[PDB]
Design a protein around this ligand. Sequence first.
Ligand SMILES: CCCCCCCCCCCCCCCC(=O)O
Ligand SMILES: CCCCCCCCCCCCCC(=O)O
Ligand SMILES: CCCCCCCCCCCCCC(=O)O
Lengths: 251, 251, 58, 58, 60, 238, 59, 59, 273
Amino acid sequence: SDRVRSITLGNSTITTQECANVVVGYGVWPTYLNDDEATAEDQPTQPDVATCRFYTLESVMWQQSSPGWWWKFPDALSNMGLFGQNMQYHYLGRAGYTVHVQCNASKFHQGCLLVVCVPEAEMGCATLANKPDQKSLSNGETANMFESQNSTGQTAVQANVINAGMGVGVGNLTIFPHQWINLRTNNSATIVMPYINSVPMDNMFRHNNFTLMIIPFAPLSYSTGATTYVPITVTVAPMCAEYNGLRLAGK
Amino acid sequence: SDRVRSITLGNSTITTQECANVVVGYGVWPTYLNDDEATAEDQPTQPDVATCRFYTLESVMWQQSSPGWWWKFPDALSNMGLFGQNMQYHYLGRAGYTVHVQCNASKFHQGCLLVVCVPEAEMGCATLANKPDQKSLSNGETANMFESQNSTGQTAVQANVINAGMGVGVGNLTIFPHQWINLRTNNSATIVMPYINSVPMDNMFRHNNFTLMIIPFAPLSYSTGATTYVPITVTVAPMCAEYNGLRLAGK
Amino acid sequence: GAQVSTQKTGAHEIHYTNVNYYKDAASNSANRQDFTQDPGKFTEPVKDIMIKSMPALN
Amino acid sequence: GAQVSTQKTGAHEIHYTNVNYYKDAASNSANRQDFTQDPGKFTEPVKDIMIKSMPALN
Amino acid sequence: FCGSAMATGKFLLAYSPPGAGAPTTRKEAMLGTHVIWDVGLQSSCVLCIPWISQTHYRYV
Amino acid sequence: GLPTMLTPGSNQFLTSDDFQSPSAMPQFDVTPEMDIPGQVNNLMEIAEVDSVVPVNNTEGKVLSIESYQIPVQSNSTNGSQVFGFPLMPGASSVLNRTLLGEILNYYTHWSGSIKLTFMFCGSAMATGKFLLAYSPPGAGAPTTRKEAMLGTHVIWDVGLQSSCVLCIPWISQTHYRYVVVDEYTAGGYITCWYQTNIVVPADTQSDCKILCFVSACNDFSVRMLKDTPFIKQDNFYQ
Amino acid sequence: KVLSIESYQIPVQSNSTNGSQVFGFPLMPGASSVLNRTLLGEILNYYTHWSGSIKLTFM
Amino acid sequence: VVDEYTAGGYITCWYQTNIVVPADTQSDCKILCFVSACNDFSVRMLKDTPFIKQDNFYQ
Amino acid sequence: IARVADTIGSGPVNSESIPALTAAETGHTSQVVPADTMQTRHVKNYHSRSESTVENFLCRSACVFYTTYRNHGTDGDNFGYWVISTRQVAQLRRKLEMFTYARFDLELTFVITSTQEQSTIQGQDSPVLTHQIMYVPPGGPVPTKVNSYSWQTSTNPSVFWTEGSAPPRMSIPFISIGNAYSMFYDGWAKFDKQGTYGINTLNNMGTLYMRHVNDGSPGPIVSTVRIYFKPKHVKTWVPRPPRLCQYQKAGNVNFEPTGVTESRTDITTMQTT
Ligand SMILES: CCCCCCCCCCCCCCCC(=O)O
Ligand SMILES: CCCCCCCCCCCCCC(=O)O
Ligand SMILES: CCCCCCCCCCCCCC(=O)O
């Protein structure tokens, strides 16, 4: 039916028997930069198979008091195979992403997760005068956790989930490309993100520029005697990745 | 859908709401012997309704430590209605079989049964010098049970399930027409078996020549408080049964 | 009555002759090149067509 | 299927027949008269044509 | 079948014309006209009792 | 010369080979052929001829002409047996020495239908009805007339036509059978009973003789030539 | 397990950690003891060379 | 046969998530493996098997 | 041509079609190719399945028996015999038994070798030896002595062979009374089910008899004849799993229960092997 779906990228495949649909960005499928949009003159690199493939991040464990998590991209993929390698040797880069969040339950479990990709998600620090340090913003392959109370710390991020680290209403995050994992309905959510930026290409190490947030709006719940370990796995795949500006490796 | 199915033979009918499919032998539907394949000259008998119908054997009870069962045919039908009668009064016979194995569970039960029809399933004795006696090979309408350990006995059959009584690998039995009853998927399995033999007709009392095996590869399992009595019923129907060589009754 | 057939050669960059000498067909040589294949008997013995991309069970 | 070829004879002042008996092409006899020559691979592997009478380097 | 949705069963609905007694075991009932009923999403099943008599009509 | 390779079987003497050899008498002029009566092209033309069966081959009768005579008499009971023997034309002593059985013993396999003709060699004033039955294997041999009529049979009424034929049809699971006795290729049983009595007037003999003949039908065939166990020899005949 | 039907059964259970291994074996259909006794591996042992793609179905 | 020049690789299975089950259900489950060749599979150079042996003639 | 399938090119996919998911309960073996679960290139495959045909797999000469006979004997009683069967050797029996039914012609070859025995009969200068193999079909007269009348071979086929020459060979057609040779039989010989059970019920092929055609010389000599079978013009039906347990008898399928495979340390050890 329309609940089944498969996605093959590179030498990787993801099957889902209980999905909702695919959310495709803003109706735009990711493509390669055209000649009339390009400004960098050297012939770009396009690995096209070794990089445009699925990578699985580190899983988290959904608990009854989990406020939520977030990843930064492509910082989360900065050490993933040849995709991270091309990022180090190149000054400029460009990709779109297929994002697949997967969480299965027992049909007696309940809870609803919001899965959203926020472009240019600039986050505030817990101390108003300071700035968040590098690790609080993006731990790479590891998720940074939202809090269900005000954060403290000179370099900490204001990770109170009610504002989503950005100073907005967390219920208003549905303006971005989003989906819901509702345990009674579906065990996965997938979003295809095109490349969004104010320039045709950017440095992949000092800019993201979208964040993945997973926020439980309905908490996890079950009766005693059921499985209590409900993990959420994240599998991202860059699409149409190209690179410009080859030189020595860094960072 | 394709999970429902009905089979009407004679004055009998079997409905199934949760099946997988029908396995038809080696792609051959059973038929009557043709003039250019026949060698016996007398006009054969074809009851065609009173014999080509469904017969239900004796049920067994699936337990958590059941190695498996087996029936021999048409010895299992040798006392079933008019099909057994025509077998006694005739020297030669010929039939194909629809086999329907049925086992239902509670959707909290688990276990996987292999249902296979083995042509010419010659079985070995527990004592290497001797031969298995008549009852160990085929109890007729009653199932002979596999063991989960080496058998003993002068006339006993070597019923250790790991070799399936034949001296082969039990996991390699899928070369024959087979099916699986997986309790989470389907509650029945059906196989249509044509007549397979090196002669156009044979004596139905001194030759089988296929066996039905039901081997649980995944054991039966459930949590306490669930139903613990899970029976397996077998319903076979001869197809296109014809008979030659009428004389006094025997055996 | 001589039969000229194609020898077994390699692919990606060659005939032999045969005469039968005896009156019985069993005296002939082996049918070394009878290449026929029908795996569907054993791999797809089911009644319905069972297309690949479709779900096996509804 | 008999192949009549030219024997190896002398120049400046003669066929044989061949029949294949076996089904494999490896059972045949050697290709004693496969006269092909392409020495340019090893003697002139350079990119430019390098005419003889001209100077090799300007 | 007015039981639960988690319950499952198979039932043999049999009809036997007269001439012998009433069947006393399932082995004797399957010789007659019957329908094996598998419970599931379709909750009902029909056993059609065909008209097998020697006369055209019967007495009430 | 022509290059050639010797293969297995060279310089071997196989007694059933078809080769050409040189004639030790070149240009010999054979006698002109003559039209002789009774030319035989197939051995099956000999098996298809009737030959008397020694059904009464008991311990004393076998050295006498009384072996062929099947005794039938007037009885006081009903349904008695007259004779019975198994359908083994190659192995049974009731059949293996006839023209059909003598030819079978040179072969390993047979197949086809058999005829059993019966001539009633009693008086013209005698009358009888006989049940000639054949029963395929799988059950035992019938022991009463009630069990013989379930099988293949012919009720024989004696009269102006003195003979009757019981055609033993070919009912087996294989295409051929073994001339030797084998349980896999059992053939069945031929039996004869009284359908009525031998009723005779006064001053007539109640005891009569019946004769048996056995010949093959037009679908009969043999296979795999062998030597006979019937002829032997210790040393060369001088 | 090798003398029992439990050889074919691959145990999977609910865990408390994340990313555990379930099984692992080498791709040697002719030599590996995990494969050389199946219908595919039993046929390979009559031959010296193989080639092609393999399917691994999981129920 | 096993040869280092023609190594084949490794087949592994991991948990992408957990086996999540409701109450009154068995957390322990079984999985089954099947192996079959694809339509591009092929073998070559017939040999004898190391699987069957014999010391003397079967009587 | 038994040419395998080419690999088709396939790019990325995102759709509802699920080639990797199926129901193995159906008994259907999935027809997934590598081009369904990954981006493949185009490969023109020129590999052929010409060597796995049942004719090529079975058309190999195999020794099925050997026996010995002497020249002196008593009295004698110096000759050999073999009741023909294909189940006294392990190697050819396992190949033939991968199928339930087979029809084929045979190529029969013999390899006869003679050996000098220990003695003190010096000096010995013995002319070349000649052997006679006689085949007696079921029911024919059997040789009782090394010089009995049955060796006349008036109707029984026999091959005479002198040592030092090519091993003798002859072809046999398909000779069974059934429509196919049976490797397996799941019934008895008698209708009451007493007696022989299994494939021995259908074993009625005949017997071979061997002797020296020469009169015995003073020096003792023992000859051994090796019989070789070669299936030809093969047709097989109903393949079955290969024999896993070691054979024990020729007449039956009796076995000693064997493990499914070779064991290893744990479920994840890559040392296999
Ligand atoms: C002079 C040499 C003649 C010998 C002729 C030998 C003929 C015997 C038959 C050989 C075929 C037996 C094949 C049986 C197959 C089986 O039982 O599976
Ligand atoms: C195995 C190669 C055999 C070569 C040919 C040698 C045998 C004689 C061939 C005679 C050809 C003419 C016969 C015919 O008309 O078919
Ligand atoms: C090496 C010289 C071989 C001489 C020829 C002997 C072999 C038989 C030739 C038969 C020719 C007819 C066959 C054909 O049609 O090609």
